[PDB]
Ligand SMILES: *[C@@H]1O[C@H](CO)[C@@H](O)[C@H](O)[C@H]1NC(C)=O
Ligand SMILES: *[C@@H]1O[C@H](CO)[C@@H](O)[C@H](O)[C@H]1NC(C)=O
């Protein structure tokens with residue numbers, strides 16, 4: 001999941017310092033590994049989308 | 054230290070049993086008071102019984118904050134705190150999209 | 161909406177809280193809710209935990225309430241001396257609650273205040289209530305029916321036109 | 322904006338809370354706020370209730 005690139009759950013190990021021009025979220029994406037959510041999560045999603053990595 | 058804003062991210066552990074919260078961080082009330090020049094907030098764990106997602110009925114929720122340059126973020130805590138080891142920084146421009154089809158590198 | 165019972169059971173406490181505000185046949189309370197009180201006045205409120213699962217195939221509206229009494233005395237009167245905590249929890253929810261007793265301007269003569277919260281319980285999910293006082297409990301969950309349109313107005317209805 | 326007094330009066334506590342941040346005739350505070358401190362250091366702040374009507 002896009003937010004997982006910040007915290008760093010095991011699915012997001014490849015993208016902890018990723019750099020992109022086009023970021024593609026998928027449905028199967030998971031921001032997390034231990035049960036829990038993000039606070040104000042779309043706001044931060046929208047930021048990382050245009051972050052270039 | 055850098056000249057672009059910094060992404061700081063922490064986490065609070067809302068436990069399942071109040072006993073689990075004492076077992077880990079010690080008994081008594083827990084409090085995290087994130088502070089910056091722009092951001093003054095405060096967070097408290099909420100230990101209580103929950104349906105078990107992936108097993109652990111505990112819950113680690115994440116919060117975030119944008120720290121301006123030359124600015125300092127101050128954490129003040131006494132338990133139930135997931136700590137940031139590294140800050141995140143943004144590299145430039147990108148397009149965020151959401152799809153379920155392949156990626157054609159040729160078109 | 162279609163209401164469905166949530167299956168909750170309580171022992172050792174009361175379950176018939178009422179007030180002059182919600183007057184039915186004399187004093188009463190919300191139809192789909194049940195005010196929970198210590199078994200007798202100033203008694204102890206036991207620590208309870210109740211759970212409901214959305215067994216149907218559409219989300220379930222779960223509405224509970226917190227009673228911020230007017231006086232800390234009224235809070236000890238109804239639920240008992242000692243601190244009071246309510247931890248609502250599902251798979252998408254993870255929230256505690258604490259009554260903040262304090263005088264408020266008299267609305268319907270009662271300076272206490274009830275905070276109504278709500279959450280959407282996904283199908284197959286469970287909402288967990290852990291509490292020991294100051295908890296207005298849900299009796300029936302609500303489910304949505306179909307399509308409608310909400311309008312606000314101030315004129316007659318006319319089925320001829 | 323027009324300002325009108327709210328008619329709040331206190332006792333058993335202090336009302337002169339000020340700080341070096343809000344500087345006037347020395348250290349002061351907000352003109353429309355009143356920093357309520359306990360009557361003395363570590364003295365229990367008595368529970369209070371005040372009301373204003375528009
Ligand atoms: C803060 O601003 C001063 C301006 O004199 C500059 O010299 C210094 O490098 C800056 N530090 C950071 C961390 O931005
Ligand atoms: C809920 O989960 C159980 C166990 O996996 C399953 O048998 C049941 O069909 C599920 N309910 C729905 C509505 O899918």
Ligand SMILES: [Ca+2]
Nearest residue numbers: 162163164165
């Ligand atoms: Ca029916």
Ligand SMILES: [Ca+2]
Nearest residue numbers: 323324325326
């Ligand atoms: Ca005036």
